[PDB]
Design a protein around this ligand. Structure first.
Ligand SMILES: CCC[C@@H](NC(=O)c1cccc2c1CC(=O)N2)[C@@H](O)c1cccc(F)c1C
Length: 357
C-alpha cells in the first residue's frame, strides 16, 4: 500500500515547496522531502523536549496523534526500500554529521545514527574553518563520485556542529522506445525570456490527461529505481492556481490511474540541482531551537553546550489510433513530483522555470 509516514512526508513536501514558491515566483525549485525529513528525524534522536518536538512537528508529524516509535520505524522501512540494489543503481543519498573533536559524544546517538539511519558521524577540527569546510566537501564529493563539489561555501567561526544532506538520482526511462536524437527547441521562461533545451519528440500511448481542477496537463512517466515522475504543465496563466490546488489526495488518484491515450510529446532532457540553507528554510517552518544557543542536544553530548551551526541540502538529478492525438510540449515552466513506487514517498518535488538557471 504505502509507508505509515508517507502522508506526513507529502504535507512536508507541500509546506516546504509553498514556502520556497512564495519567497520568489521566478526561481527554480528542486529538493528531496524524503532526504531532508530523514536527516532531521535522525538528528531528533540526539535532542529532547521543545528542541526535539519542534523538529518532528516541523516535518508535519502531529506528536499528539502518531507515536515517536512509528515515526522512526517509518523512516527505517523507507531507508530499507531506498537501499535495495535496484534503487542504489540510480539513487545515492547520504547524511554527514560533523562534530568538534573536543566534544565527549554519547555512544547511543552514534549507534542509532549509524544503525537505524545508515548515516555517518565524523569528528573535525573547527579550529581550522578552511580545512573543516574542505573535509565536509571532500566527504560529499567522495560520496557522489565527484558529482557534488564545494557544497559548503561558508562556515561561521564558532561552528561546532554541521549537518550535510545530499541526494543524487540518475534518471533513465524504464520503458525502451524508438530513440531519436534530441532537437534544440525554444523553452518559454516568461514573455521576454527564451532558452534552447534539448527536446525528445515521442508519439505513443502515455499516462497523460488534462485536469480541470488543476487547469494543467498531467503526465506520469516511469524511471529505473522504481520511481514515477508526475509532471504538471499549467494552462496559460494558471501556474499559481496549479500550485494552490495540489493535494496528496489528488496526487494519490493520479498514481492509481493506469489509463493511457495516444499523445505527441516534446520532453526536455533536463538535469537540475537544488542547494538549500536548511537553517534558513526550516526556520520559516518553525524548526529554530536546534540551531539556537538554547538547543537541547544532550542526546549528542551530555557535558558541553551544543547547537547545529550549519545545515545544507543538495539535490541533483541527471538524465543518462489513426487520428491526430494531442500535442503537449513541456516548453514552459512546469511543476513536478518524483514518487518511490513501493512507499509512495515523495523523493523529489520542484519546478523548472529557467532550465539554464
Ligand atoms: C518534462 C520531462 C522532464 C524530464 N525529462 C526526461 O525524463 C527525459 C527527456 C528527454 C530524454 C530522456 C528523458 C529521460 C530519459 O531516459 N531520456 C526530466 O528532465 C526531469 C525534469 C525535472 C524533474 C524530473 F523528475 C525529471 C525526470
Amino acid at each position: 500500500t504505502f509507508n505509515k509516514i508517507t502522508p506526513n512526508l507529502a504535507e512536508f513536501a507541500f509546506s516546504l515547496y509553498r514556502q520556497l514558491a512564495h519567497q520568489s515566483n521566478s526561481t527554480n525549485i528542486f529538493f528531496s522531502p524524503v532526504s531532508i525529513a530523514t536527516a532531521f528525524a535522525m538528528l531528533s534522536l540526539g535532542t529532547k523536549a521543545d528542541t526535539h518536538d519542534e523538529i518532528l512537528e516541523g516535518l508535519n508529524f502531529n506528536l499528539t496523534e502518531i507515536p515517536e516509535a512509528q515515526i522512526h520505524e517509518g523512516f527505517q522501512e523507507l531507508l530499507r526500500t531506498l537501499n535495495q540494489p535496484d534503487s542504489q543503481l540510480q539513487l545515492t543519498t547520504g547524511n554527514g554529521l560533523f562534530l568538534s573533536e573536543g566534544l565527549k559524544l554519547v555512544d547511543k546517538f552514534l549507534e542509532d545514527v549509524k544503525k537505524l539511519y545508515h548515516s555517518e558521524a565524523f569528528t573535525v577540527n573547527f579550529g581550522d574553518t578552511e580545512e573543516a569546510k574542505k573535509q565536509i566537501n571532500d566527504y560529499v564529493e567522495k560520496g557522489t563520485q565527484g558529482k557534488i563539489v564545494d557544497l559548503v561555501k561558508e562556515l561561521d567561526r564558532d561552528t561546532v556542529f554541521a549537518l550535510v544532506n545530499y541526494i543524487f538520482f540518475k534518471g533513465k526511462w524504464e520503458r525502451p522506445f524508438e530513440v531519436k536524437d534530441t532537437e534544440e527547441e525554444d523553452f518559454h521562461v516568461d514573455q521576454v525570456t527564451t532558452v534552447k533545451v534539448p527536446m525528445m519528440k515521442r508519439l505513443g500511448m502515455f499516462n497523460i490527461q488534462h485536469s480541470k481542477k488543476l487547469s494543467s496537463w498531467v503526465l506520469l512517466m516511469k524511471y529505473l529505481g522504481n520511481a514515477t515522475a508526475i509532471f504538471f504543465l499549467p494552462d496559460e496563466g494558471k501556474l499559481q492556481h496549479l500550485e494552490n490546488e495540489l493535494t496528496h489526495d489528488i496526487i494519490t488518484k493520479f498514481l492509481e490511474n493506469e489509463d493511457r491515450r495516444s499523445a505527441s510529446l516534446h520532453l526536455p532532457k533536463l538535469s537540475i540541482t537544488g542547494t538549500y540553507d536548511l537553517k534558513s528554510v526550516l526556520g520559516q517552518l518553525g524548526i529554530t531551537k536546534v540551531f539556537s544557543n538554547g538547543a537541547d542536544l544532550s542526546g549528542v553530548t551530555e557535558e558541553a553546550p551544543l547547537k547545529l551551526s550549519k545545515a545544507v541540502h543538495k539535490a541533483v538529478l541527471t538524465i543518462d489510433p489513426m487520428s491526430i492525438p494531442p500535442e503537449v510540449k513541456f516548453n514552459k515552466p512546469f511543476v513536478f513530483l518524483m514518487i518511490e513506487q513501493n512507499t509512495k514517498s515523495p523523493l523529489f518535488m520542484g519546478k523548472v522555470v529557467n532550465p539554464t538557471q
